[PDB]
Design a protein around this ligand. Structure first.
Ligand SMILES: *[C@@H](C)[C@H]1/C(=C/c2[nH]c(/C=C3N=C(/C=C4\NC(=O)C(CC)=C4C)C(C)=C\3CCC(=O)O)c(CCC(=O)O)c2C)NC(=O)[C@@H]1C
Ligand SMILES: *[C@@H](C)[C@H]1/C(=C/c2[nH]c(/C=C3N=C(/C=C4\NC(=O)C(CC)=C4C)C(C)=C\3CCC(=O)O)c(CCC(=O)O)c2C)NC(=O)[C@@H]1C
Ligand SMILES: *[C@H](C)[C@H]1/C(=C/c2[nH]c(/C=C3N=C(/C=C4\NC(=O)C(CC)=C4C)C(C)=C\3CCC(=O)O)c(CCC(=O)O)c2C)NC(=O)[C@@H]1C
Ligand SMILES: *[C@H](C)[C@H]1/C(=C/c2[nH]c(/C=C3N=C(/C=C4\NC(=O)C(CC)=C4C)C(C)=C\3CCC(=O)O)c(CCC(=O)O)c2C)NC(=O)[C@@H]1C
Ligand SMILES: *[C@H](C)[C@H]1/C(=C/c2[nH]c(/C=C3N=C(/C=C4\NC(=O)C(CC)=C4C)C(C)=C\3CCC(=O)O)c(CCC(=O)O)c2C)NC(=O)[C@@H]1C
Ligand SMILES: *[C@H](C)[C@H]1/C(=C/c2[nH]c(/C=C3N=C(/C=C4\NC(=O)C(CC)=C4C)C(C)=C\3CCC(=O)O)c(CCC(=O)O)c2C)NC(=O)[C@@H]1C
Ligand SMILES: *[C@H](C)[C@H]1/C(=C/c2[nH]c(/C=C3N=C(/C=C4\NC(=O)C(CC)=C4C)C(C)=C\3CCC(=O)O)c(CCC(=O)O)c2C)NC(=O)[C@@H]1C
Ligand SMILES: *[C@H](C)[C@H]1/C(=C/c2[nH]c(/C=C3N=C(/C=C4\NC(=O)C(CC)=C4C)C(C)=C\3CCC(=O)O)c(CCC(=O)O)c2C)NC(=O)[C@@H]1C
Ligand SMILES: *[C@H](C)[C@H]1/C(=C/c2[nH]c(/C=C3N=C(/C=C4\NC(=O)C(CC)=C4C)C(C)=C\3CCC(=O)O)c(CCC(=O)O)c2C)NC(=O)[C@@H]1C
Ligand SMILES: *[C@H](C)[C@H]1/C(=C/c2[nH]c(/C=C3N=C(/C=C4\NC(=O)C(CC)=C4C)C(C)=C\3CCC(=O)O)c(CCC(=O)O)c2C)NC(=O)[C@@H]1C
Ligand SMILES: *[C@H](C)[C@H]1/C(=C/c2[nH]c(/C=C3N=C(/C=C4\NC(=O)C(CC)=C4C)C(C)=C\3CCC(=O)O)c(CCC(=O)O)c2C)NC(=O)[C@@H]1C
Ligand SMILES: *[C@H](C)[C@H]1/C(=C/c2[nH]c(/C=C3N=C(/C=C4\NC(=O)C(CC)=C4C)C(C)=C\3CCC(=O)O)c(CCC(=O)O)c2C)NC(=O)[C@@H]1C
Ligand SMILES: *[C@H](C)[C@H]1/C(=C/c2[nH]c(/C=C3N=C(/C=C4\NC(=O)C(CC)=C4C)C(C)=C\3CCC(=O)O)c(CCC(=O)O)c2C)NC(=O)[C@@H]1C
Lengths: 266, 289, 162, 172, 172, 172, 162
């Protein structure tokens, strides 16, 4: 996005990122950069140990035996990708990680969760992974030679608006990674076809003045509430409380049976 | 509810005053109404000069940065509130004022005094204010978005002792909680300590005997222990509270307020005698049977 | 946005590398250019109003129809002339920003990106702005490195428009 | 991200105004300061491995709980990830020094870092301590008078210290 | 919240049906195990302070970085908050044991606790380790065969273990 | 919040270390500047209404679109809010100057102010311009030589400049 | 953090007013006390190890059962002695923090709040720490304003423990 929203949302680096294309007759440093970019983006910005590198796959990329898309497929199908994204993750978290790593976006619909779940159940992890890489979306966005990059913060054709908001649920910052078993943040949002407020970068913080407590810290409690007291006017509720009253807010939320969806520092 | 005696007490203006709620996506008049209601009720109807107004808390409430409950908390923890109600008051009076402002009711028993005085002494005034505001009672009555209001009417977890003590704490609509006859003295220390009640005396303009207050000592007890025996033959006994006794003058008149237990058969004579002594009848309560 | 220092850092970061002698030479080139760029920005700022007014008049002279045909996209009335002068001032101010920054990054971020569909939606002819930029090129009165860098920005805008 | 020039450019563009004379003179003063800024970047880069290794050694000596079994720097993978974090923080501090602006730190290096450390259980205070050690070592290296033209580099040293402190406060 | 009876009542009411003979017999079997359930609750309550203190000591011995300066359990108010959190977890586990249902533990203790610990920077994995220590001590205390009518308490012990695992899984 | 003393204390406590001799010497140095700091706070406070009013008049003179009908400062309520905002910023800047630390300004005033302004359509660039006007008005008032003891206030002026820049950067 | 300056600003902010002469006098008193506080912190810091060892020895002498009774809460072994020396060092270091800050705020924030729950949970006698603080009072060797302010913080801790 433009700078004025970019600094607020903490997505400046994504906006200024330039797609990396492996051209013909590329030098050694260009193949090195492509391999590094693929490892960074497909493995979700983990510190990749040299013992986890795909030496044969990157040799085939180096000798121009395979394309960038093929190397991306090899990294995605590799046991390293399985270990850190599949074997200890729920299926819905796993496929949103696949959407982030392979297509550079957040899931748009619950039907996309129904797809890749049935696809896994029929054809295994390999068929499920190949669905993303062989998709029309991957072809039109990246082709055979462009390293996949995150696209959820930019307006795409055939995109739902919610994706942009949901993008902030799968991209938590430039210095973040998809390393830690974890549950998807988008489960209820996808199932009920909703959107959640974006609290990313500096958007989550709120004014304090003298209303914050001793340590000048406010907390935002996003809860789902119903009538169990006073009249409830909305199903969604947001409470801004100081640290000193946080426990009290939690307990009164708890004794009314309201479910806490998110708690963040504001 | 209170219907026939609402105007005599100060309850009638609060009968048609609905609770002030800040709805989601509120307008600016809604924000100003919440600010006005909070100033009137939390600060006990004191006049608020412009220099004492909490501009930042008002701004934050207007913006939605804080809720009504948070704004009430900020007002109750402010230096304005502590100057008006904390620094010059016995902590039992502070507790009475806290219950009246933040909960809209009088303290029920000595246990509340115990809890709040211990909490003030061990963790400070701010923590005590928090206990008033984070209480289950506050949540069920006002919640997050409703300005606290006087709870005159009977409710689920009430005691009638609170109904009687409300009129010890509240002295009329044009009254300001720092402009009452008892001034800075605790109104309920004896009552909460002894688990007793006082006959309800209404506010000034609606009740001629409004100014009656019992003294420190030498007060006529509520009930007629002994029955009608000291009064010869009598049917029923009544405790009459009399204020503004002045006509005979000192030394014939020592205390301008006097409570007398009189038989039914002397009630006519008692009333005439009260008229002669220039007094005003505050209340008359059955004392026997 | 596109400047020698930020792109050197972004290229180095995408490669996971420290800044090496290459990026240091990039900074040296920026330092060599920067004083001339700053004095070009000062000279354009001081004579900004005269340059903007003269550029608008040159556009009106070479495109006289813009001064008497009625319509929202033309400068026949005062509102059109105010919009036109504001647009030319936008161009000149962003060019001074480029001279300060040492790259076309201000032009790309503020003006160049999305200029074509704006010009299309509001039926604004890019040849008008090309003539305004040509007047600015011919009347800024700069010399040496300041002129060379400023003209590079002005005809970068011209190339983007044509 | 911004450099020292584009920061004031973006501020002026939001205001819709030209850079004033004072801003242009301040930028000219920054340009005259540029050579020592390039020396500070070069000196930190040329000693980056020593800075990272010595600071890590000092941090693990002061906090042996990190490297004992069950600690967050125990096992080779976790220890190597820690060493990479140190190197990365030092590299982004060099980026901030080179550009003259801190936006590269917030945009990239400190963008969600505290969230990452909390999610993984990495002790942020220990990272801040390691960053402080790298700060002291790098400031010593920048201030070294041997083999360089003598001059006052107090302003650039203060700026580098500010970048290091901001990195430390992002995780502390 | 729900207890063991009201859970099946809610499920039956959502289906519009009476409990079946099998459901009534399962509830009767729960009733027949009620004395042991009360015994287990009583034994954990009577040793609650010991469980919390011993588990905290074991946790801080195995994870010393929690109590070193800068650690999340360092300073008296944070160590006391941590001990209070241990106590709260144990108390709600006892509530779940008493009711025969995990709804009280989920709805009144674990609701938003992971998000709370992430927001505060409290390491949830270390909380889970403390909960595991409380689990092992409490299961030993419930199985102690001294001064109680001998019986097989494996089912209630497995249920208590499940509640402890629920707490530890929610925090970690 | 922190002041100039408790900031170093908090960093040391996180490290579990006593303040070094250099830190204590620096704190003694800022004690030696304390009279100058109190003078600065007093001079800005004593000229606060003039600073806010002149800065606002200049801001609307150079940005007439703020006060045109439909502009963000149009209507007496929004003009009053704008003036109040200027005075709030100036007051928290004086708080930061008094404490010797930007923690009060950042935590109580600046945090979430940009979000609020965005959500309201308050133009943050012009608020930053207004803070810049209050900037030189206050720096000239602090540096006014008449009726004060002779001495160099360059360090305290730089610190106040930094607070004013933090506030303008936060809003813009 | 209860310090003169932070509390002065907080009280002024609750009233929403600028800092008046009252807060300036608070700052002047803080300046009057600060040099003595800093020298007190330096003297306590330089002598810290001997103070902690001597205080630990004084506690072990007054309560010999702590060095000879098995149990986690006692110092009969090296682990308990190390915990005891660590606790006394915490006390001394936070007292130096109080001397630097000019108030009991470090003691409140780091040590005092929650200490009774600590001592109850881990069966630690507050009388031990009272004896350690008395040794520090009797042996810090401070004089004048430094001694008065340091003894105020040590007595604050003693009063909290008693
Ligand atoms: C503080 C940083 C230290 C310091 C620096 C300092 N350097 C110079 C001068 C120069 N430094 C360079 C740098 C380079 N030349 C190269 O080819 C390379 C590799 C690409 C580098 C890094 C240059 C070009 C100069 C100018 C020539 C000269 O040697 O004078 C100065 C002098 C002032 C100036 O701005 O030129 C200073 C102050 N000096 C110290 O005392 C600090 C320890
Ligand atoms: C596993 C939990 C352990 C175990 C338990 C066990 N308890 C009983 C029997 C009883 N225990 C009680 C309990 C109480 N009586 C009281 O008044 C109170 C105080 C409020 C308590 C806690 C009771 C009433 C009984 C029944 C009578 C009896 O004393 O036996 C049994 C026997 C089976 C039964 O369900 O009645 C068992 C098995 N036994 C073990 O071996 C485990 C270590
Ligand atoms: C114009 C009337 C107002 C305005 C608009 C504005 N929007 C954006 C950015 C985005 N708009 C969208 C919306 C969609 N993308 C889609 O694909 C769809 C259909 C499914 C919609 C509805 C999104 C997602 C973005 C962000 C990503 C992107 O920009 O590509 C901007 C740019 C914001 C920035 O800072 O760059 C603007 C300016 N702004 C106004 O002031 C008008 C009132
Ligand atoms: C070392 C001083 C401390 C320490 C570090 C540690 N960090 C991680 C893991 C990660 N570190 C990062 C950080 C970055 N990645 C980037 O790309 C950027 C640049 C913008 C940064 C700052 C990330 C994202 C991770 C996530 C995991 C990954 O593998 O990348 C670990 C590993 C934890 C684990 O393996 O579970 C460690 C150990 N740990 C200490 O104890 C030191 C105090
Ligand atoms: C060593 C005994 C001889 C030698 C080797 C050499 N090989 C290459 C380059 C490549 N080797 C391969 C082969 C494979 N890669 C794989 O992944 C697998 C398993 C499927 C095999 C068999 C490939 C594909 C390449 C090209 C890619 C790459 O360079 O890594 C080189 C480099 C050639 C060059 O750089 O141009 C060399 C040096 N060289 C000798 O002199 C020995 C006789
Ligand atoms: C003015 C003609 C005389 C005078 C007045 C005076 N009044 C007060 C204080 C209060 N006045 C009221 C009255 C009302 N408040 C209401 O809300 C209503 C309508 C329902 C009325 C009629 C109240 C309650 C107060 C107390 C509140 C407060 O803030 O004071 C004072 C102030 C006394 C003091 O500050 O100590 C004064 C001075 N004084 C004169 O000399 C005139 C004859
Ligand atoms: C101790 C030397 C003697 C003693 C004391 C005692 N006091 C109470 C109860 C109360 N004390 C107070 C006091 C105050 N309230 C305030 O507002 C202030 C400070 C501003 C003070 C000093 C109050 C209000 C109570 C009631 C609440 C409470 O009970 O805590 C008791 C308990 C009385 C009872 O029966 O509950 C006692 C024991 N008693 C002696 O015998 C000593 C001579
Ligand atoms: C009915 C047999 C007689 C009667 C009753 C009557 N009562 C009221 C009003 C109130 N009743 C109470 C009593 C209580 N409040 C409590 O909290 C408790 C339990 C702890 C008691 C016993 C109170 C305080 C009120 C006033 C407040 C309220 O009603 O909410 C009325 C209404 C009077 C009026 O409307 O003014 C009536 C009619 N009246 C008869 O004639 C019967 C003999
Ligand atoms: C004079 C400084 C102020 C003043 C006085 C005032 N007092 C009265 C009336 C009475 N005063 C008393 C006195 C007492 N009762 C006792 O038992 C004691 C102790 C032994 C005392 C001191 C009484 C009983 C009355 C009423 C009967 C009587 O008048 O004697 C008045 C007259 C009030 C009226 O209007 O009736 C006055 C004026 N008034 C001021 O303005 C001075 C500040
Ligand atoms: C002048 C050379 C000719 C001319 C001008 C004219 N322009 C417009 C309208 C717009 N101009 C722009 C351009 C920009 N906005 C920016 O933010 C920037 C980048 C920093 C640029 C270059 C835009 C977006 C518009 C439309 C919105 C607006 O009105 O501001 C008009 C009016 C068109 C209309 O329909 O309102 C005119 C008249 N007209 C001539 O005849 C000249 C030859
Ligand atoms: C101890 C094993 C670990 C640990 C704990 C720790 N927790 C906090 C703070 C809070 N904990 C809670 C949780 C609850 N409060 C409740 O009322 C209930 C029931 C709903 C729960 C589960 C809350 C809300 C807080 C914050 C508010 C408050 O403390 O009252 C802290 C303090 C953090 C801080 O002071 O910044 C700590 C230390 N820390 C560890 O290191 C252990 C692994
Ligand atoms: C003046 C230079 C510019 C301007 C200002 C303006 N601000 C608002 C509204 C608010 N300002 C705040 C800010 C604060 N409130 C606080 O308590 C504090 C301290 C923590 C701050 C910094 C808030 C919260 C609001 C919203 C609530 C309120 O209205 O008070 C407005 C009004 C916006 C509206 O539409 O109502 C205005 C006008 N506007 C300009 O154009 C100037 C550049
Ligand atoms: C020394 C006077 C006596 C003694 C000490 C002793 N202490 C513990 C355990 C703890 N001490 C603390 C205290 C603090 N932790 C802090 O962070 C601070 C504030 C900065 C303080 C004051 C705590 C929290 C513990 C328990 C957790 C921990 O181990 O850190 C022990 C061990 C008790 C146990 O059960 O493990 C001992 C032995 N023992 C003596 O005999 C001396 C007389």
């Amino acid at each position: 996005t433009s700078l004025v929203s970019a600094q607020r949302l903490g997505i400046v680096a994504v906006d200024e990122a330039i797609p990396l294309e492996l051209r013909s007759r590329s030098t050694e440093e260009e193949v090195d950069a492509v391999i590094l970019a693929v490892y960074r983006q497909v493995l979700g910005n983990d510190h990749l140990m040299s013992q986890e590198r795909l030496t044969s796959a990157e040799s085939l990329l180096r000798g121009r035996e395979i394309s960038v898309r093929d190397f991306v497929r090899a990294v995605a199908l590799s046991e390293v990708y399985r270990q850190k994204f599949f074997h200890s993750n729920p299926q819905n978290r796993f496929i949103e990680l696949n959407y982030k790593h392979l297509l550079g976006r957040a899931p748009y619909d619950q039907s996309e969760i129904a797809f890749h779940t049935d696809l896994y159940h029929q054809g295994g992890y390999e068929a499920e992974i190949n669905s993303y890489i062989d998709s029309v979306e991957y072809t039109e966005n990246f082709g055979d030679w462009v390293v996949p990059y995150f696209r959820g913060f930019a307006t795409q054709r055939n995109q739902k608006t919610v994706g942009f908001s949901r993008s902030f649920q799968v991209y938590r910052g430039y210095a973040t990674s998809d390393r830690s078993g974890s549950r998807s943040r988008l489960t209820r949002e996808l199932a009920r076809n909703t959107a959640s407020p974006v609290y990313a970068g500096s958007t989550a913080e709120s004014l304090r003045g003298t209303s914050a407590g001793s340590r000048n810290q406010m907390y935002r409690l996003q809860v789902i509430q119903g009538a169990a007291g006073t009249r409830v006017r909305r199903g969604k509720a947001e409470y801004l409380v100081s640290y000193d009253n946080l426990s009290a807010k939690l307990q009164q939320i708890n004794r009314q049976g309201d479910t806490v969806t998110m708690i963040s520092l504001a | 509810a209170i219907t026939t005696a609402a105007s005599r007490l100060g309850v009638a203006p609060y009968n048609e005053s609905r609770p002030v709620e800040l709805r989601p996506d509120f307008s600016l008049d809604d924000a100003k109404m919440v600010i006005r209601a909070v100033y009137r009720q939390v600060l006990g109807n004191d006049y608020i000069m412009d220099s004492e107004r909490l501009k930042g808390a008002e701004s934050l409430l207007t913006n939605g940065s804080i809720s009504v409950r948070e704004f009430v908390r900020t007002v109750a923890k402010s230096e304005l509130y502590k100057k008006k109600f904390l620094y010059n008051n016995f902590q039992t009076r502070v507790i009475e004022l806290n219950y009246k402002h933040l909960l809209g009711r009088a303290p029920f028993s000595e246990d509340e005094v115990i809890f709040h005085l211990d909490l003030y002494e061990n963790q400070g005034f701010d923590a005590d204010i928090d206990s008033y505001i984070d209480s289950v009672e506050y949540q069920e009555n006002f919640g997050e978005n409703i300005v606290p209001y006087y709870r005159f009417n009977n409710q689920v977890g009430d005691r009638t002792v609170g109904f009687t003590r409300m009129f010890r704490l509240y002295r009329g609509y044009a009254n300001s909680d720092r402009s009452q006859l008892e001034r800075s003295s605790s109104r309920l220390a004896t009552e909460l300590g002894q688990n007793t009640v006082s006959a309800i005396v209404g506010p000034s303009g609606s009740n001629a005997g409004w100014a009656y207050r019992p003294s420190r000592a030498g007060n006529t007890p509520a009930k007629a222990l002994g029955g009608t025996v000291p009064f010869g033959q009598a049917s029923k006994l009544f405790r009459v509270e009399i204020t503004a006794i002045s006509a005979p003058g000192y030394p014939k008149v020592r205390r301008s307020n006097k409570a007398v237990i009189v038989p039914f058969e002397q009630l006519n004579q008692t009333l005439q005698q009260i008229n002669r002594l220039g007094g005003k009848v505050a209340s008359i309560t059955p004392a026997s049977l | 946005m596109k400047t020698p220092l930020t792109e050197a850092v972004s290229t180095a970061d995408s490669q996971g590398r420290f800044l090496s002698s290459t990026e240091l030479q990039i900074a040296f080139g920026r330092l060599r250019q920067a004083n001339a760029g700053l004095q070009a920005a000062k000279a354009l700022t001081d004579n900004a109003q005269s340059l903007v007014n003269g550029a608008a008049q040159a556009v009106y002279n070479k495109f006289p129809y813009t001064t008497q045909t009625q319509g929202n996209n033309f400068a026949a009335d005062q509102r059109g002339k105010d919009k036109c002068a504001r647009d030319i001032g936008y161009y000149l101010r962003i060019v001074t920003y480029c001279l300060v920054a040492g790259g076309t990054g201000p032009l790309d971020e503020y003006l160049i990106a999305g200029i074509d569909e704006i010009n299309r939606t509001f039926d604004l002819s890019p040849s008008w702005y090309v003539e305004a930029l040509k007047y600015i090129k011919a009347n800024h009165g700069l010399s040496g490195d300041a002129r060379d860098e400023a003209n590079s920005y002005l005809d970068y805008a011209i190339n983007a428009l044509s | 991200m911004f450099d020292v020039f584009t920061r004031v450019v973006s501020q002026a563009d939001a205001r819709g105004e030209y850079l004033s004379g004072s801003q242009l003179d301040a930028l000219s003063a920054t340009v005259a300061e540029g050579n020592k800024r390039i020396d500070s970047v070069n000196r930190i880069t040329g000693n980056a491995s020593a800075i990272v290794s010595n600071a890590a050694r000092a941090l693990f000596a002061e906090q042996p709980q990190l490297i004992q079994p069950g600690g967050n720097a125990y096992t080779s993978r976790r220890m190597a990830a820690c060493l990479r974090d140190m190197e990365i923080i030092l590299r982004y501090v060099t980026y901030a020094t080179f550009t003259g602006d801190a936006s590269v730190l917030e945009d990239r290096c400190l963008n969600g870092l505290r969230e990452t450390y909390v999610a993984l259980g990495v002790p942020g205070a220990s990272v801040a301590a390691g960053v402080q050690k790298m700060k002291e070592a790098a400031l010593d290296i920048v201030n070294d008078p041997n083999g360089i033209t003598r001059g006052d580099c107090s302003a650039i040293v203060a700026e580098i210290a500010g970048y290091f402190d901001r990195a430390a406060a992002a995780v502390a």
